[PDB]
Design an enzyme around this catalytic site. Sequence first.
Site, PDB file in Angstrom:
ATOM      1  CG  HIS A 658       7.895   6.697  -8.058  1.00 41.34           C
ATOM      2  ND1 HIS A 658       8.950   6.365  -8.883  1.00 41.34           N
ATOM      3  CD2 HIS A 658       6.982   7.312  -8.848  1.00 41.34           C
ATOM      4  CE1 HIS A 658       8.685   6.758 -10.116  1.00 41.34           C
ATOM      5  NE2 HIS A 658       7.498   7.337 -10.122  1.00 41.34           N
ATOM      6  CD  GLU A 659      12.512   5.282 -10.343  1.00 41.22           C
ATOM      7  OE1 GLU A 659      12.457   6.296 -11.081  1.00 41.22           O
ATOM      8  OE2 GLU A 659      12.585   4.111 -10.795  1.00 41.22           O
ATOM      9  CG  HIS A 662       8.732   2.869 -13.201  1.00 39.09           C
ATOM     10  ND1 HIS A 662       8.250   2.313 -14.365  1.00 39.09           N
ATOM     11  CD2 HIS A 662       8.815   4.201 -13.422  1.00 39.09           C
ATOM     12  CE1 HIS A 662       8.050   3.268 -15.254  1.00 39.09           C
ATOM     13  NE2 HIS A 662       8.387   4.423 -14.708  1.00 39.09           N
ATOM     14  CE1 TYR A 700       8.408  11.814 -11.000  1.00 40.88           C
ATOM     15  CE2 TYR A 700       8.077  11.859 -13.380  1.00 40.88           C
ATOM     16  CZ  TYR A 700       8.898  11.638 -12.279  1.00 40.88           C
ATOM     17  OH  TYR A 700      10.206  11.241 -12.449  1.00 40.88           O
ATOM     18  CD  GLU A 707       8.073   8.364 -15.357  1.00 45.41           C
ATOM     19  OE1 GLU A 707       8.215   9.266 -14.506  1.00 45.41           O
ATOM     20  OE2 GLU A 707       8.738   8.307 -16.420  1.00 45.41           O
TER      21      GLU A 707
END
EC number: 3.4.24.83
Lengths: 748, 16
Positions: A658-659, A662, A700, A707
Amino acid sequence: NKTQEEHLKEIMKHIVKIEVKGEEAVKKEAAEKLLEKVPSDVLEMYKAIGGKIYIVDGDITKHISLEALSEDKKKIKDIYGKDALLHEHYVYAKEGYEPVLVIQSSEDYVENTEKALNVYYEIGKILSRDILSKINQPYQKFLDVLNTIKNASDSDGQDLLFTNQLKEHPTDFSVEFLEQNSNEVQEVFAKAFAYYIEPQHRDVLQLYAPEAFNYMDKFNEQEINLSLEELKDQRMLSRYEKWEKIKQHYQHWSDSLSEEGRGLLKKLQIPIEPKKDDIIHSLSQEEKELLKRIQIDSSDFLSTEEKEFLKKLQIDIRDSLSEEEKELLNRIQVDSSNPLSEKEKEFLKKLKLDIQPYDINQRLQDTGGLIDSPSINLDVRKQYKRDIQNIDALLHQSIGSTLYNKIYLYENMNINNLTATLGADLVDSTDNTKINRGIFNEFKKNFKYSISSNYMIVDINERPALDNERLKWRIQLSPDTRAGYLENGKLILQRNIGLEIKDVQIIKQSEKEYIRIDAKVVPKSKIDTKIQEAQLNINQEWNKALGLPKYTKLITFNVHNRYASNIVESAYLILNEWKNNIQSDLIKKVTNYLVDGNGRFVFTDITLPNIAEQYTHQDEIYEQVHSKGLYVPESRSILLHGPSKGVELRNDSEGFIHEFGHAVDDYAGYLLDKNQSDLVTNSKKFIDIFKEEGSNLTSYGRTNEAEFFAEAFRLMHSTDHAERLKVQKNAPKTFQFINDQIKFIINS
Amino acid sequence: MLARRKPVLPALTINP
């Protein structure tokens, strides 16, 4: 190991009852030798249970010691299994109060190799049902062995040491099995022992018995040392002796000190929460009144514990003068339908700080030792420093004195401090006694060296731990490690210490199961090595696949707290999972943008408001953030906190992927501009994408156009095509923009 | 007891 290892390796003969035939000077030669073989400790660790070994002659069922003639029990089942009664045999170990064995007398023990196994068989049983039981006997350990060889390829091992019962029984032995069977295992345990000890059979064992050997081995010259001790802790008429001795030494130290000294030695022992007014009475005029109307509970910034201390730091103000103290309290809850403010977040954020506990040890284990780091304020910062600097020079007594020897201290803590993600499922959740083997292994797997950056205080004698405190470390400090003596039965021992996790089974402590992080100290010096010396093999081994200039620094390490041996070493799986699911051409291409601005993949165990790759490039301290996941453009690198479990993140893996995504929402921001450092997400062609379907996948999914994507892309990857396909069915009204930009970055 | 756990979260970063 020579010398005294004979004084204390026989003197224990203070159990050698030689009602031997008056014909002086032989038998001992036989007896001594007969016993020589059996480990040294495992002898004494019998003495301290009623030391006595009867070595009388001929008719043995005559000797005083044997008068409880259990004529029924007289039918002595022999190690091999052939029936036989007392008279005949030559050595029966009588059990019960002041347990004892009566070894027959005959120069013939050296030679005869059977009544040599038996004398060992017994003196082993007298080790499995007694001694090695008052602790809790063979628990999970000797179980596996005790089974892996029950269902091993060459159906033979069994044949050696079992019975229809244990041999025929269905599946395999399961804990519970230690029920009304302890009277069987104990034996199998003996036989095992009984063998390994006998010179010739160690050989016959070794081969015929796979695991039986090793276990039965280890446990006799490297593991025994313990059982003897975790059995001294049982008895207590010493449990103090120790306590006493260990003080004596450390005593003179405790004498001359000071209130100031003995003071913070407490300030440390216990935090010192904030203040009531002093804090509040330190705000601004404008700040004060702002503090009133705050919709308070709304921000996931202030955790309960402190969220409350804020609603409270509010009443101490509202509790003053005029009527608006009644009305504003009402007129304020009027438009209490709008989440929060942007000029107030700070108004609270800047507080989220100052309202902190000040534990010169919860902000030490928070920065590996970075007592100099800009995670806290300016003066606070300079206190711990001033302090951690004093206490340091405070605890200066070596230890290893003319009194105590190999001495271990203890400490209990909860797996939620090392790896909260496993914390969850550590304990069964369906027996709150039985530990979930599953998540057990996952824990232990990569746990070989732990380091405590902070000040360790330790229970100097196994103290029963709570109910969430589930790990019981039996650390073995060492001459030269420095500590202090804190009345209470607890030792504080210096900063920066190293621990080679040399064993991690699972025990049974009073009907409840426990993980035993039994370890031993080594110099951090020798530890930090094993790290970078590993920080490489990862990089190198990665630079290849990834495709970067040999000798670069992408994955950088930063581990100082108790779970490096997995903080770092984990990585491999993380990254490896990053590549695996995504498409090579992608990351290879982008992992470069980042490196193009010297960025990293910081795997850390400290705290994100401490990890360098983010604080100097931060902006202002009033802000910080922290957590498993993190992305930072100012220093385009990924920070991933090892311990902390995640807000709907099943694991570290899925938290990184995920991060990183980003950072993808960063690529377009440059793969589409000279100087409009933007994010594909910060676009009008995207805001819509968000203000339409931007709230469908999960929780989220909001709080930031970005995000929604991080998690969006995060999703498109799933170990299972399902969780991803959901993004297709749900809102292709984004599930296209992703794939579009994906196959948009792959080229330039 | 040795926890604390929720050191902070976002905003949007807020300045130039």
